[PDB]
Design goal:
- The PDB classes it as viral protein/immune system.
- The entry lists the keywords Venezuelan Equine Encephalitis virus, Virus-Like Particle, virus like particle.
- The entry is titled "Venezuelan Equine Encephalitis Virus in complex with the single domain antibody V3A8f".
- This is part of a larger assembly, with chains A and B.
- Chain A is largely without helices or strands.
- Helix content of chain A is 0%, strand content 0%.
- Chain A has no helix or strand.
- By secondary structure, chain B is mainly beta.
- In chain B, a hairpin with a 4-residue loop joins β7 and β8 (78-84).
- The chains are: A little secondary structure, B mainly beta.
- The A-B interface holds A 7, 10, 13 and B 55, 57, 59-60.
Chain lengths: 53, 125
Amino acid sequence: KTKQFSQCTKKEQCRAYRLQNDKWVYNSDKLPKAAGATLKGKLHVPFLLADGK
Amino acid sequence: DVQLQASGGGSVQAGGSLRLSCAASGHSFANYHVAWIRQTPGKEREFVGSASRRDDSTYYADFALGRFIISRDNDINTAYLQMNSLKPEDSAVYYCVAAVMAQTTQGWTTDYDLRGQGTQVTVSS
């Protein structure tokens, strides 16, 4: 909804955020964490070390 | 003790004007958000308006817009509320609250970092 907000004049007085529910991410330190239990599964790591000739 | 002392009220006919002052004794308003709270008898304290020195902004309630003005004079560490066009519904006691950021300005403030004694305003029809 393209909703305006009166009483605010200068745009950098505040900001706007983005929200998403699916499409999870790796536990990278370059992002801020979400709120609540931060865990909804685990995945496997391809290219594991193994013996060879 | 850092105390806020409000004054400037009284009884005035409807449609007039008044100017309330509340000053701080013990500390200055140099780093305080000033918010005015009104308490009519028989109901709960209602937000009136707030002013911020950090962004020089002023927030006003629905009934307060177009009639009330908030100004600050840090030289004599006081906050002024100049209202005009009095109405009978405006008769109540007024306090001013001084707070150090802390996001206390979310709707109902109900924090009172610094609480002061209020002054009574009567509006006669």
